[PDB]
């Protein structure tokens, strides 16, 4: 996987150190593509929009 992860928004896999990985699946998102503004990689767990839709 991990070298194969791409950003959900822009679909590229570049700028790895900005490319946030979902804690619930294999998806990712650049912090700079994220809206609302995400200035830094978060310390806690992060879940993508697909994983959120699974929550109750």
């Amino acid at each position: 996987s991990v070298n194969k992860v791409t950003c959900l928004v822009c679909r590229k896999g570049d700028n790895d150190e900005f490319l946030l990985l979902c804690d619930g699946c294999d998806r990712g998102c650049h912090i700079y593509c994220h809206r609302p503004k995400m200035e830094a990689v978060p310390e806690g767990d992060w879940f993508c929009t697909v994983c959120l839709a699974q929550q109750v």
Binding site: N3, D16, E17, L19, L20, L21, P42, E43, G44
Partner: peptide, 5 residues
């Protein structure tokens, strides 16, 4: 959270 790096 972690990054692809």
């Amino acid at each position: 959270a972690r990054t692809k790096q």
